[PDB]
């Protein structure tokens, strides 16, 4: 369950569980506002809006996306509707261990750093 | 298993079974030379080396990577050492269906086409 995956995450963040487990959960790590949701069904998607370096050119940017040994390594993309970059990662709900979400979140944030205090966001 | 998966894909592509399955398997689909390998352990990695439109700016190229409902939608990246772009997708070996590799490869080929069947060994 998504609700149950979130709940266990929040306990691991030492964050109080809202009465309402909304469809899109906001969590802020340090300066980084992250969003957590199920999309598509059966998949946990996490994403954040990174602040890019002006001097980074396309090769440099695209280099962050090469495959690696870590399947939680986040992907840098661009949202043409909102007109801004989007950093995201994703893993199957059906395959989580008790530490999978926390790890996904940490890997998403380290990914933003390359380009903890928590708040129920 | 990696071997078996590939065996079924080949059979589905009407490609002979090559006597000894190598760690990186080449398959050509139309003009697209693709590669299939297990990396990391437990994952089926497929990649191809696309031809980019040099008129595309960073925002347009990265747009291809936005998330969607299809988890086999390929990712556009760059290989610093090889000095070239790289398009790839990936899925867990332990959850395949009889159509999983076939579909993964078709989604890889479509992404290549979006940046601009006949199957053979490569």
Give an account of the 3D structure.
Two copies of one chain form a homodimer. By secondary structure, chain A is α+β, with helices and mostly antiparallel strands. Chain A has one domain: Yope Regulator, Chain: A. Chain A is built from three helices and six strands, in the order H-E-E-E-H-E-E-H-E. Chain A has a six-stranded antiparallel β-sheet with strand order 4-5-3-2-1-6, covered by helices on one side. Chain A binds chain B through residues 39-40, 43, 45, 47, 57-67, 69, 71, 75-80, 85-86, 88, 90, 92, 94-95, and chain B through 39-40, 43, 45, 47, 57-67, 69-71, 75-80, 85-86, 88, 90, 92, 95.
In N-to-C order, the SSE pattern of chain A is: HEEEHEEHE
Termini separation of chain A (Å)?
A: 21 Å
Number of strands of chain A: 6
Domains of chain A, number: 1
Report the oligomer.
Answer: homodimer
With strands numbered from the N-terminus, the spatial order across the biggest sheet of chain A is 4-5-3-2-1-6
Question: Compute the gyration radius of chain A: what is it?
Answer: 14 Å
Number of helices of chain A: 3
The CATH architecture designation of chain A is: 2-Layer Sandwich
Major sheet characteristics of chain A: 6 strands, antiparallel
- CATH fold-level topology of chain A: Yope Regulator, Chain: A
The first-level CATH class name of chain A: Alpha Beta
Shape of chain A: globular
Give the helix level of chain A as a range of percent.
Answer: 25-40%
The SS-based structural class of chain A is: alpha+beta
Strand content of chain A: 25-35%
Biggest interface goes to: A-B, 31 and 31 residues
């Amino acid at each position: 369950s998504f609700e149950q995956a979130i709940t266990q995450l929040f306990q691991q963040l030492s964050l109080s569980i809202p009465d309402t487990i909304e469809p899109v959960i906001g969590v802020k790590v340090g300066e980084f506002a992250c969003h957590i949701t199920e999309h598509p069904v059966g998949q946990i998607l996490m994403f954040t809006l990174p602040s890019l370096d002006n001097n980074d050119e396309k090769e440099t940017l695209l280099s962050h996306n090469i495959f690696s040994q870590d399947i939680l390594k986040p992907i840098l993309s661009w949202d043409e509707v909102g007109g801004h970059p989007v950093l995201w990662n994703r893993q199957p709900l059906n395959s989580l261990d008790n530490n999978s979400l926390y790890t996904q979140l940490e890997m998403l944030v380290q990914g933003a750093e390359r380009l903890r205090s928590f708040s129920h966001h």
